[PDB]
Amino acid sequence: KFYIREPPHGSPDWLKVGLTLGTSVFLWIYLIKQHKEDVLEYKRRNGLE
Amino acid sequence: MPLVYMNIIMAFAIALAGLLMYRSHLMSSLLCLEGMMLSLFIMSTLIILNTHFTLANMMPIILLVFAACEAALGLSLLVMVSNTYGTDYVQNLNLLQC
Amino acid sequence: RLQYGPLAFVLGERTTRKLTETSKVITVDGNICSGKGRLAREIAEKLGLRHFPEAGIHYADSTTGDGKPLDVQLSGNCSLEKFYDDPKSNDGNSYRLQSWLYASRLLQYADALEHLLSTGQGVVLERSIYSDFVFLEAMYRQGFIRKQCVEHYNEVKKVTACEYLPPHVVVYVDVPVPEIQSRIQKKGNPHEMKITAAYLQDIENAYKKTFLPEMSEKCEVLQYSAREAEDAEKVVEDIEYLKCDKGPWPDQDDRTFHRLRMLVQNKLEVLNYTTIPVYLPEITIGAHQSDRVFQKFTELPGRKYSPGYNEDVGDKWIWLK
Amino acid sequence: SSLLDLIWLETILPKTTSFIQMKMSIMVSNQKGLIKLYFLSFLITIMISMTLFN
Amino acid sequence: MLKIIIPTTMLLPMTWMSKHNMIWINATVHSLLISLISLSLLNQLGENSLNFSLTFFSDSLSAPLLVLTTWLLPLMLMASQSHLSKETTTRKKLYITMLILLQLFLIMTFTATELILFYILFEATLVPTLIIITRWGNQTERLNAGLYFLFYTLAGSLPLLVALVYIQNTTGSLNFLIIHYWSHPLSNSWSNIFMWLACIMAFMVKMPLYGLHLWLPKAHVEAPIAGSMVLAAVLLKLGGYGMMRITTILNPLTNYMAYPFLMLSMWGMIMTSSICLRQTDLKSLIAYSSVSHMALVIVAIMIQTPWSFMGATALMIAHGLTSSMLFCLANTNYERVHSRTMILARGLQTLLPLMATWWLVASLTNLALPPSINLIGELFIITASFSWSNITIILMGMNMMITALYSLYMLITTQRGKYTHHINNIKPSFTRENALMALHILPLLLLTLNPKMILGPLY
Amino acid sequence: ARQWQPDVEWAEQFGGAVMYPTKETAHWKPPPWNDVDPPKDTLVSNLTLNFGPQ
Amino acid sequence: IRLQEDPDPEDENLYEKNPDSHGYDKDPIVDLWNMRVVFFFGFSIVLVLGSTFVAYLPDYRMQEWARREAERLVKYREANGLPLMESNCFDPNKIQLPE
Amino acid sequence: MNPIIYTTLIMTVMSGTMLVMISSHWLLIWIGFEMNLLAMIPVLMKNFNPRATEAATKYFLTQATASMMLMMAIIINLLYSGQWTITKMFNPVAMTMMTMALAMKLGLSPFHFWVPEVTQGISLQAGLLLLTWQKLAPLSVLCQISQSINPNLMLTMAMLSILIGGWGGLNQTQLRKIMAYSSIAHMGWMTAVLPYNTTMTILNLLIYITMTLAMFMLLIHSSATTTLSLSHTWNKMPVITSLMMVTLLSMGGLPPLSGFMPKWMIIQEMTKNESIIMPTLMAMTALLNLYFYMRLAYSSSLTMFPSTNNMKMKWQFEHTKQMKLLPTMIVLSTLVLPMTPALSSLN
Numbered sequence A: 001k002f003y004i005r006e007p008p009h010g011s012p013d014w015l016k017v018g019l020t021l022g023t024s025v026f027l028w029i030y031l032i033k034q035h036k037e038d039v040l041e042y043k044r045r046n047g048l049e
Numbered sequence B: 001m002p003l004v005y006m007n008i009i010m011a012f013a014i015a016l017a018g019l020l021m022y023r024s025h026l027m028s029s030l031l032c033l034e035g036m037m038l039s040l041f042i043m044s045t046l047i048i049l050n051t052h053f054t055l056a057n058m059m060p061i062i063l064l065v066f067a068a069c070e071a072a073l074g075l076s077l078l079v080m081v082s083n084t085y086g087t088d089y090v091q092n093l094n095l096l097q098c
Numbered sequence C: 001r002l003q004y005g006p007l008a009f010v011l012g013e014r015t016t017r018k019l020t021e022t023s024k025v026i027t028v029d030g031n032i033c034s035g036k037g038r039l040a041r042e043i044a045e046k047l048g049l050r051h052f053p054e055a056g057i058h059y060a061d062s063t064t065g066d067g068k069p070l071d072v073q074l075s076g077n078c079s080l081e082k083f084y085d086d087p088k089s090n091d092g093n094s095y096r097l098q099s100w101l102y103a104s105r106l107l108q109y110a111d112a113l114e115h116l117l118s119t120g121q122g123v124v125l126e127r128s129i130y131s132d133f134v135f136l137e138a139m140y141r142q143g144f145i146r147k148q149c150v151e152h153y154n155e156v157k158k159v160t161a162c163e164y165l166p167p168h169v170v171v172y173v174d175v176p177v178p179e180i181q182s183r184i185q186k187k188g189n190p191h192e193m194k195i196t197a198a199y200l201q202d203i204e205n206a207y208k209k210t211f212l213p214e215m216s217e218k219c220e221v222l223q224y225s226a227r228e229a230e231d232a233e234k235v236v237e238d239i240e241y242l243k244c245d246k247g248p249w250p251d252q253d254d255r256t257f258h259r260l261r262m263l264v265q266n267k268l269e270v271l272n273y274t275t276i277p278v279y280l281p282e283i284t285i286g287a288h289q290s291d292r293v294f295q296k297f298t299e300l301p302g303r304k305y306s307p308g309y310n311e312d313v314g315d316k317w318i319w320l321k
Numbered sequence D: 001s002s003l004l005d006l007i008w009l010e011t012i013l014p015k016t017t018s019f020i021q022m023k024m025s026i027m028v029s030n031q032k033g034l035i036k037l038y039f040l041s042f043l044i045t046i047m048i049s050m051t052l053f054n
Numbered sequence E: 001m002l003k004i005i006i007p008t009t010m011l012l013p014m015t016w017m018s019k020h021n022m023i024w025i026n027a028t029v030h031s032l033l034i035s036l037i038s039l040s041l042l043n044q045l046g047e048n049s050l051n052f053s054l055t056f057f058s059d060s061l062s063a064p065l066l067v068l069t070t071w072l073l074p075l076m077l078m079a080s081q082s083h084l085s086k087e088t089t090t091r092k093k094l095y096i097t098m099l100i101l102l103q104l105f106l107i108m109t110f111t112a113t114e115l116i117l118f119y120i121l122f123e124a125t126l127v128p129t130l131i132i133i134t135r136w137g138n139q140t141e142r143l144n145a146g147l148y149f150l151f152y153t154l155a156g157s158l159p160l161l162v163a164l165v166y167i168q169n170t171t172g173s174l175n176f177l178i179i180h181y182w183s184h185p186l187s188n189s190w191s192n193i194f195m196w197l198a199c200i201m202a203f204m205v206k207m208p209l210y211g212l213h214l215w216l217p218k219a220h221v222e223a224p225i226a227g228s229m230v231l232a233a234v235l236l237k238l239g240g241y242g243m244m245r246i247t248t249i250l251n252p253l254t255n256y257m258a259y260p261f262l263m264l265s266m267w268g269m270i271m272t273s274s275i276c277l278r279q280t281d282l283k284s285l286i287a288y289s290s291v292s293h294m295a296l297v298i299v300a301i302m303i304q305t306p307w308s309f310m311g312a313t314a315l316m317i318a319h320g321l322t323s324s325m326l327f328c329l330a331n332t333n334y335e336r337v338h339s340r341t342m343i344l345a346r347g348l349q350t351l352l353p354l355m356a357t358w359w360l361v362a363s364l365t366n367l368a369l370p371p372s373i374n375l376i377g378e379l380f381i382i383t384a385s386f387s388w389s390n391i392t393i394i395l396m397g398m399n400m401m402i403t404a405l406y407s408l409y410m411l412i413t414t415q416r417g418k419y420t421h422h423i424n425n426i427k428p429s430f431t432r433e434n435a436l437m438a439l440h441i442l443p444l445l446l447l448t449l450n451p452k453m454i455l456g457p458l459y
Numbered sequence F: 001a002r003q004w005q006p007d008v009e010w011a012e013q014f015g016g017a018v019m020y021p022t023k024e025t026a027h028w029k030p031p032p033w034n035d036v037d038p039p040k041d042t043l044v045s046n047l048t049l050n051f052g053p054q
Numbered sequence G: 001i002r003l004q005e006d007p008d009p010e011d012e013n014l015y016e017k018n019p020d021s022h023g024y025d026k027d028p029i030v031d032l033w034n035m036r037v038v039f040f041f042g043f044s045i046v047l048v049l050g051s052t053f054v055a056y057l058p059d060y061r062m063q064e065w066a067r068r069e070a071e072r073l074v075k076y077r078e079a080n081g082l083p084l085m086e087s088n089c090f091d092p093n094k095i096q097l098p099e
Numbered sequence H: 001m002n003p004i005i006y007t008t009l010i011m012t013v014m015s016g017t018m019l020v021m022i023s024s025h026w027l028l029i030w031i032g033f034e035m036n037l038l039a040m041i042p043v044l045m046k047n048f049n050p051r052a053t054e055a056a057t058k059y060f061l062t063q064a065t066a067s068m069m070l071m072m073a074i075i076i077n078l079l080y081s082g083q084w085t086i087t088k089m090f091n092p093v094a095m096t097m098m099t100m101a102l103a104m105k106l107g108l109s110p111f112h113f114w115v116p117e118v119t120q121g122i123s124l125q126a127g128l129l130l131l132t133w134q135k136l137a138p139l140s141v142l143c144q145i146s147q148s149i150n151p152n153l154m155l156t157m158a159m160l161s162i163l164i165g166g167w168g169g170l171n172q173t174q175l176r177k178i179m180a181y182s183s184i185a186h187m188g189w190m191t192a193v194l195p196y197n198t199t200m201t202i203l204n205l206l207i208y209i210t211m212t213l214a215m216f217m218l219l220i221h222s223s224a225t226t227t228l229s230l231s232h233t234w235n236k237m238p239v240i241t242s243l244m245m246v247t248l249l250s251m252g253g254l255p256p257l258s259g260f261m262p263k264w265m266i267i268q269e270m271t272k273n274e275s276i277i278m279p280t281l282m283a284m285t286a287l288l289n290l291y292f293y294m295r296l297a298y299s300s301s302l303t304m305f306p307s308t309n310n311m312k313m314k315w316q317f318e319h320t321k322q323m324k325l326l327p328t329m330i331v332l333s334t335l336v337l338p339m340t341p342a343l344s345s346l347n
């Protein structure tokens, strides 16, 4: 212990850390799925594949 | 247009010129502001009654409602200014400059 | 919630509900080298209140980082011993010390109010910002400071102390000047032994003629001599049997208490007007000296980053914090 | 160096323009903050916009 | 061009992530490597330009300017590390960051293929320069100097922006290749006159043109050594490059509209040389020499013949190198005595021999001494102006005489004579300073050996 | 031997009510630090009434 | 005085602490290695290698190509009695003048 | 003021603006204006002092007059067409009344004085909300009625706005007055491009809102309301001054910063319609705005002004409240020039 008073950010807010990581992962997987669906729909509509 | 609309528009213009030309009191300016909405009410109801726009007859009432909302706002600001300075003179509202 | 603010207020945390009617602010005052410190200790321990020793230099050091004080060059840039030795210095040390002490007293008062409002426990300060001006008048009437210094002090005191609730109880310990000098000689500290008699008389005149008449109108004022101050039991009994309803504390509500607690929990807004661009030669510091001292302060061990993010003092999980 | 560089080439382009802008800024920003005055100005502007803009 | 653009954008994180004592070493080493890589752009074609992509292209006019910029960065680093010893690590890194940003903007400016992208970049070069001047300058006048520099350049360049968007709306494209192939004659009308004026005046202020030049002494005197080096070596060449680029679409109106600018340039060349004759400040003397040489380049571009364009390019490169060297030498003297007055320190030849040699070589190149590229460019410009008219030779001869006079006067005042008695803090020259002067001077002589590399596309 | 930095003269140049003062603007004063002007000593002037004798 | 300002520091001399100083850095090792890298890279690599690279750059300007083409054209034209320099750049048959 | 009352008043201001921006009826548009003003007055008067009271009084007087003129224009338009839908107005006199009323609401010259006066009177949060939101609503109305705007009147008011903003900002020293005159100039630019491309008007509005939010939040963070108060920030948090410097450079329109994009696109669009004199004058007059931005930047970041002695205690303490979206606003206001072709998405 160094600080006379406990710092507000003494230990990581694990709830916030988990929410942040989960939100990032969810957004990334959603973006990947959305891109795949967009490519498939574009190819189907243009009659390419 | 008949002369009646001319008279109502002239009255509105007179009330508008009254508001833009302060003399000493803020209360007189508020009275001029209330007269403008009276002229607007009269003009709108004259127009609506003449063309038999039946559903528009509720418009002048909403006009009156927001008229007196503005009058309430002005009276509140006037009492705060009077509490601060002792009089409702517009000359005392000079702390802020352009 | 999890931190006081508008969300906590709309949730329903109310200062009046928190208080227990025994939450009082008591400030002990007296001339130099009196028994006010021991009397404050006794009152705080008997009433169960939290004691706040007189805020000298390095109080801000004690309340931040580690409790250990910092170098004088980095905390205050002023010396009480040097003030005693050469009161009429040519580097403005007297008024630098006075302004720094006023800022420290303001910070301590904010801390005391924050503790009282967040806990409901009363506080006993060994001096307040409402008694600090007596030393300014003593300095001015002895020629130690200038009229410009007095005016700057008055401006800062106005715009800062106008926003805080006055103490509930003001306990003044009246000790005659010759007794003050005798006690100073007995203590044996050379620096305060250099104190002249005219300086001590000016503080007493300021207390008697300005501070006590000014605080008598607000709330209760109790005055004791040396003998009466020695018996703290009667003082605590007198405090416990005070009837008063003419203070601003009864007039306070939950909204005003919320505003006050928001003000006092933010220490930078407390000190906001202590650094106003009034360029007195006493307090103004040049660009180069300011840059050098600020670089040194950042080079201090636990001062480069925020408290939770200093790796050299043993803070882990920084990458996830 | 003196007559042209330090005096007249300074006076023609950068000094005269700066002086004009400073004077215009003083004129614009030197207002007493009176609602009577600038509301009379509003009235004049309304009249001018009504008459001169058709 | 990405093989040169990306390494600079990697100089940025490397500078910010390197240790506190390795910043100068890393920046210098990798700047030199980037310069070596950029040397490969000198291999140009005889028919057309090097079209890398839709965005960047290189020509015989762009390539030497890019090489000069990339070679100039490490020299600025050396001078900066001379005068910024006591700065904090963050401020040193910010200084290097401003230099790196300036180099990146200059590279993209010279390689831009559209006039609008060229405008955006060559206006973006102002921000790092202004920050450098007004932040790390020494004296009080740095603030006024920054204001003058900024507002002169912007007042010049805004009508250029309006004219460029107008030309794009009119013709369909601002691409340099398209506007060269689809160029049409400009009729003699007031609208065309004012379009010509907008473009030319922007670049003339950037040159600078005589009468529009006060910002140059103000900024060059009051900027730090790196700022002075980049301002004279490269930033004055943006105006010449722009004029050599935009005048494709301004014909035949240039034949009639060039008279005021030619007269201004010639007479102001004479006037600024004469001003140099009677200057009490060394930096001001160097700045006015820069004004004279750029006036000569303006004359070349305005007369606009194939022999003048080669002279313009050669003189631009030579002046960049020579002015950078002169500023470095003056800065070393200033670091000795903490003053810019020319007559304060004397006898520096008997106190510092090798620096006297460097002063002699730099002053010899400052005047047109054959076979230096300075003389090559000046001689080509003089010949083209003679074919233009036969009194331009009179004006050019007067200018050459006065140029020799003031260059040798500066050398004699600073170096020869007897040393000032009370100046006893003149320590021996540093290896860093000597290496800086060598790196300024040796490439100039190598260019003299191979002169076809800096004569432009018209060669 | 060190870079020039602004002093109290420069700061006082920048610390007026407005830049480029004139007579009226010099008669003006900078606003208070916390924007709270000191209250004016307005007189309440309570109504005085004779309640009686008639 | 109007400020609490530091006195102007004395000029710091690199030769006092380090007699064999190159003027790059205060630390002797950093200063020596800065000198070594600057000299090596700049002089050796950039100067020598860039100069020889520029000297032996391939003839992409087609100077020698143009000289050989001109030699061939001169030989052919003076062998057949044609003028060495053609009178027109383009073909007047393919050019159509206005009436 | 109670937090619940403050948040419901803010919700009412936003509801009034949204009613203005979604209504297809002139009466409902006027109702939205009235609701916005009524809920906006206490927000100005939140921190009670005579300056705030005077600023709120002047704001109320100006906005009430503008609303009266706007309702008169609506009634006159109804008289000659019998239509309530917000479209091209069918009477030139009604259109001129509407244009002047909306200009008075926006603060366009010569209806500008109230903007610096009110901004100086009210606090930093109140000024931020005022500038941003109260520019947001009338501009939407103008965009809806754009096709009947008198180009001569609109461009005259816009050019007057640019000139007046430049000169006032040149003279001022108070940060809130500087921000007010900056707002006047930017409104001038927007309304100048208004009769040609409402898309360019919206783009300028968005970039101006981003830059103003960043600047006002930096001022709130540093707690500086004057130039000299801002001159001490380098000794407590030097990063804030650097961010403020780059934001000020962006607001002056220097490339490649985000503030160059609106000026560039507006000049291009105006030149497409054979306007050259107006774009050249508008571009040249912005140099005054850049001058007083640069003068403000010299004091804060590029030079070190003298500090005081209690700044040491301020060093010892740390900033508590966290500004929301300040880094995002600072990035968006300086580094979005390469993303320019998104204005087609904005179309």
Ligand SMILES: CCCCCCCCCCCCCCCCCC(=O)OC[C@H](COP(=O)(O)OCCN)OC(=O)CCCCCCCCCCCCCCCCC
Binding pocket: A016, A018, A019, A020, A021, A023, H323, H324, H325, H326, H328
């Ligand atoms: C449409 C939504 C817009 C934004 C709404 C939210 C605004 C308030 C929240 C951000 C406040 C400022 C950022 C700093 C926060 C510091 C406090 C902290 O530790 O925050 C942690 C937080 C992650 O916590 P968590 O609750 O998990 O967040 C995701 C939601 N579950 O970490 C963060 O919050 C940091 C990352 C925030 C998200 C990126 C920044 C906003 C911009 C998103 C992209 C859009 C860009 C253009 C914006 C304008 C046009 C729409």
Ligand SMILES: Nc1ncnc2c1ncn2[C@@H]1O[C@H](COP(=O)(O)OP(=O)(O)O)[C@@H](O)[C@H]1O
Binding pocket: C031, C032, C033, C034, C035, C037, C054, C056, C080, C097, C098, C101, C132, C135, C136, C192
């Ligand atoms: N405003 C002030 N100016 C100068 N000195 C002060 C000020 N406030 C307190 N001091 C010094 O701090 C010390 C406070 O302790 P004191 O009042 O003597 O109680 P104790 O006898 O318990 O030490 C005194 O020596 C006094 O001189």
